[PDB]
Every structure is written in structure tokens, then in C-alpha cells.
Amino acid sequence: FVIKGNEVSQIAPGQTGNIADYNYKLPDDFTGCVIAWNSNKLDSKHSGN
Amino acid sequence: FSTPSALGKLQDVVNHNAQALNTLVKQLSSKFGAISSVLNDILSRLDPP
């Protein structure tokens, strides 16, 4: 999935916010890896994507 | 009848068991390093992890 930088911290166990609560939620006992990187050069447009 | 200390051997047993139970209950109000002694305050103030 694609999210905002201020929402990257929400892809973690126990977090709250519009993404953690309504789009994608991890279990409290989640085991695994959360990998994130900047995609501004690929997803952004001057008109807005 | 006259000597109030005559039965101390039994009164000490009663008092020691009463003190042990009162101490055990009083320990429930301690924090042991936690922010609060009440589980509901911890659950409502902090996120799961």
C-alpha cells in the first residue's frame, strides 16, 4: 500500500489514526517486518495524483 | 480476668494473620514502578504495547 509520511508511524502494533483504525491494522502480537520508502519521484504529479 | 496480657500467645496469632492480610491487600495500591496502581487507568491512558 501507499501512505503519507505522517502515517508511516501508524503501520505498527498498537497504533491509532485514520490508517491504523480504518484502512490497515496490524495485530498486537504481530510478527514480521514493516518496510517503507519514499516514492515521491514515482507517485507524485504536478496536478496531483 | 485481671491480666490483659495473659492470653498474648493467642492474640499474637490472630494479630499476625490480620496484619498479613491487611498488608497483602495494601500492596494492591502500590505501583512497583508503574504509572498507576489501577489496571483500568493503564489500559485507558496507554496504547496496548
Curated annotation (Swiss-Prot), chain B:
Residues 11-49 form a coiled coil. It comes from the Viruses. Residues 1-32 are annotated as: Heptad repeat 1. Changing residue 44 to A: In strain: Alpha/B.1.1.7. Subunit of the fusion protein that is processed upon entry into the host cell. Mediates fusion of the virion and cellular membranes by functioning as a class I viral fusion protein. Contains a viral fusion peptide that is unmasked after S2 cleavage. This cleavage can occur at the cell membrane by host TMPRSS2 or during endocytosis by host CSTL. In either case, this triggers an extensive and irreversible conformational change that leads to fusion of the viral envelope with the cellular cytoplasmic membrane, releasing viral genomic RNA into the host cell cytoplasm. This is Spike protein S2'. It comes from Severe acute respiratory syndrome coronavirus 2. The chain holds residues 939 to 987 of 1273 of the full protein.
